[PDB]
């Protein structure tokens, strides 16, 4: 599953680099920047939408990291691989990871922003004082939220491959070729879930 | 921020275009309403002059 990883980030990271070399301002755009254009400027939207660009920037490379590591992995784990690769969200320590670091990086944001003796108070009496124990659980159940929603689906996508394999060739390729067109499109969604409820946490953790 | 640069780059300058333009047509008009001022301020100065000279006789 590391290598399942490692493929991904050089994917990324060439893309990062041919980036760095083809960005103009000046002249016609090419589709690599286009590309990265359209996320940063959905992202940037959004962020601006809710907390505002100048009170929280630190979430927008957090925020198209994640959307694009985790769309170029279940992009990848679409090509015809079927006989090594597996998608990595399949394991549980990779979405656990970026589960783990994400809600430790937008709760020390939060305790930052109010103060190590401040923030947690106002966490857990939250949006109403009277559901403040429900404020713990729903605080609680972000980070729960986001793993276990990722990794479901990402193992359901792995383990339906494997159970569509079990069907002969001449039958197998066609729920094959069925279950990857969506696979696609909902792995796509997934990642877009990710990265969107990544920045409404961190809106409603800075207040 | 750049292609913002442009977008606002572009349109100052067609605005600040149209209004250079309508400057150049009323800086030449001014000039030429004050030099028409000035000449029949001259003209008319010459004669008041000439009438003087003319009562003085």
């Not at chain 1, 050089?10 to 254009?37: C, D, H, M, N």
């Not at chain 1, 108070?121 to 004082?129: L, N, R, S």
């Not at chain 1, 920045?199 to 953790?205: E, M, N, R």
């Amino acid at each position: 599953t590391i290598l399942a990883t490692a493929v991904t980030a050089v994917i990324v990271i060439a893309l990062a680099f041919y980036l760095r070399a083809k960005v103009t301002s000046t002249g016609v755009p090419s589709g690599v920047q286009l590309f990265w254009e359209a996320l940063t400027i959905q992202m940037r939207q959004q962020i601006e939408g809710s907390i505002g660009m100048k009170i929280a920037p630190f979430v927008l490379p957090l925020s198209v990291t994640i959307f694009v590591f985790i769309l170029i992995s279940n992009w990848l784990a679409v090509l015809p691989l079927q006989y090594l690769y597996k998608a990595p969200a399949s394991d549980i320590n990779f979405v656990l990871a970026l589960a783990l670091f994400v809600f430790v990086c937008y709760h020390a944001a939060g305790i930052w922003r109010r103060g190590i003796v401040g923030h947690p108070i106002k966490v857990v009496k939250g949006h109403v004082a009277f559901l403040a124990p429900i404020n713990i659980v729903e605080e609680l159940a972000k980070p729960i939220s986001l793993a276990l929603r990722l990794f479901g689906n990402i193992f359901a996508g792995g383990i339906l491959v494997a159970l569509i394999a079990m069907f002969p060739w001449y039958i197998q390729w066609f729920p094959n070729a069925v279950w990857k067109t969506f696979d696609l499109f909902v792995g796509l969604i997934q990642a877009f879930i990710f990265s969107l409820l990544t920045i409404l946490y961190f809106s409603q953790s800075m207040e | 921020a750049e292609r913002e640069a442009m977008l606002a780059k572009t349109a100052a300058d067609n605005r600040k275009s149209a209004e250079q333009v309508a400057a150049a047509q009323a800086d030449y008009e001014k000039e030429m309403a004050e030099a028409r001022a000035q000449a029949s301020a001259l003209r008319d100065e010459a004669r008041a002059a000439g009438r003087s000279v003319v009562d003085e006789k």
